[PDB]
C-alpha cells in the first residue's frame, strides 16, 4: 500500500460546493488523490424549509445553505464524507439518524457517537458542542421545535458508551466538533490569543470536559475539531491534536497523509456494535433515551470474546459489517435500525 490522504474538514455552515471546489482544486494542483473527507460539523443538512424550525442560528442570519441541493440529487458529492453534528445542525434530522446514516449519496453522519472503519482506520466521531446543564438531559423523540435549542448538546452518556474502544487496538483519529476541554495550553496559546484575545478570558478552560475525558482515555493518534474558526495544533502525549477553521476562510482544510494499512470500504467498528448492542435495555423507549436509570457501564461490563462473536455474526447476518446507502427516510431509519438492535440484543438470551 502507497497511502492514503484525507482531507480534514472545521466546519461548513453549508457551504458544500465551496468545499468541494476547494478540494477538487487541491487534488488538481497536487496531483493527489482524496480517499475521504471529514467533517468536524456545522452541516446543516436541511432537506427543505420545513427542517429551518430546527436550526439554531439568529432569524437575521438563517439561510437553508446548499444541503438541499444534494439530497435532491442537483449536486452529487465527489468524494465520501463522513461527519459529525456541530452547533448548526437540522438537528431533527441529526436524532431520527442518532445511530449514524447516510443524510445523501456519499454524506455519512456518525449519530450521536460511533466508531467506525475505512481503510483498516478506526474513526470515532462525538458530536454536538459542550452546555453543563444539558450533560444528564434525554433525548425525546420525535423532535420537537422546543428542543431546537438543546438537541446538539453533548450528552455525558457518550463517555460511557467511547471510553472502552481503544482496548483491543488504538483509535486512529477522533472528531469532536468543540475542542477538548485544556488543550488550549498544549500549543502557542500565545500567538492564539493574539489572533483571538476573547479566548484569553477562558483560559485553560475552553472547550468540553466530555471531549477532554474521551481523549484521555482513547489517546487516538489524531484528534480533530473545529467549531472555533481558527486553526490550532497541539500535542497531547501520544495525540496530535488539529483545529480548523470555516469553508470559505483560511485554513478550513487539511490533509492527513496516513499509511494504507488495507484498502476496504467503510464498515462498521466492531467493538462498537458490541457496546450498541449490549446497551439496548437503555435505549429501549423510543421515545426517551438513553434511559439512565439503567447504568451504561454495568450494562458494558457483560461483554465477553465469546459473546462478542456471537454479537458481529448475528450483525453480520441481519445488517453486514459494510455501511451501505438506505433511501428510506430518516424517520424510517430510525425505527430500522433500532429493530434490529433489540432484535440481536434479545438474541444473546442475557439474564
Ligand atoms: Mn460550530
Ligand atoms: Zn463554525
Redesign the pocket.
Request: glycine fraction near 24%.
Given at each position: 500500500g502507497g497511502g492514503q490522504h484525507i482531507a480534514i474538514v472545521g466546519?461548513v455552515?453549508g457551504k458544500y460546493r465551496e468545499m468541494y471546489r476547494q478540494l477538487s482544486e487541491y487534488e488538481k494542483s497536487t496531483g493527489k488523490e482524496i480517499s475521504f473527507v471529514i467533517c468536524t460539523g456545522?452541516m446543516q443538512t436541511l432537506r427543505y424549509e420545513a427542517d429551518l424550525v430546527y436550526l439554531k442560528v439568529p432569524p437575521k442570519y438563517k439561510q437553508m445553505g446548499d444541503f438541499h441541493l444534494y439530497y435532491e440529487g442537483k449536486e452529487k458529492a465527489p468524494y465520501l464524507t463522513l461527519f459529525i453534528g456541530?452547533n448548526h445542525e437540522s438537528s431533527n434530522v441529526l436524532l431520527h439518524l442518532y445511530n449514524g446514516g447516510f443524510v445523501c449519496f456519499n454524506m455519512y453522519y456518525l449519530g450521536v457517537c460511533s466508531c467506525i472503519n475505512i481503510n483498516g482506520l478506526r474513526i470515532v466521531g462525538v458530536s454536538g458542542i459542550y452546555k453543563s446543564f444539558d450533560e444528564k438531559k434525554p433525548y425525546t423523540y420525535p423532535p420537537s421545535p422546543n428542543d431546537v435549542v438543546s438537541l446538539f448538546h453533548t450528552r455525558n452518556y457518550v463517555i460511557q458508551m467511547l471510553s472502552n474502544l481503544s482496548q483491543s487496538s488504538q483509535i486512529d483519529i477522533s472528531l469532536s466538533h468543540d475542542w477538548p476541554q485544556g488543550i488550549v495550553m498544549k500549543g502557542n496559546y500565545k500567538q492564539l490569543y493574539r489572533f483571538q484575545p476573547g479566548f484569553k478570558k477562558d483560559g485553560a478552560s475552553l472547550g468540553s470536559p466530555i471531549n477532554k475525558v474521551i481523549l484521555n482515555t482513547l489517546k487516538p493518534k489524531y484528534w480533530i475539531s473545529?467549531?472555533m474558526?481558527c486553526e490550532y495544533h497541539a500535542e497531547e502525549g501520544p495525540t496530535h491534536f488539529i483545529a480548523l477553521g470555516?469553508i470559505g476562510y483560511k485554513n478550513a482544510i487539511s490533509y492527513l497523509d496516513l499509511p494504507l494499512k488495507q484498502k476496504t470500504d467503510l464498515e462498521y467498528d466492531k467493538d462498537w456494535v458490541c457496546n450498541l448492542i449490549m446497551t439496548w435495555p437503555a435505549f429501549s423507549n423510543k421515545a426517551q433515551f438513553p434511559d439512565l436509570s439503567y447504568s451504561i457501564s454495568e450494562l458494558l461490563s457483560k461483554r465477553t470474546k465469546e459473546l462478542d462473536k456471537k454479537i458481529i455474526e448475528l450483525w453480520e447476518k441481519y445488517i453486514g459489517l459494510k455501511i451501505i446507502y438506505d433511501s428510506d427516510t430518516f424517520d424510517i431509519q430510525f425505527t430500522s435500525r433500532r429493530f434490529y438492535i433489540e432484535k440481536i440484543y434479545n438474541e444473546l438470551n442475557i439474564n
Open positions: 466546519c455552515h456545522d456541530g473545529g467549531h474558526h470555516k
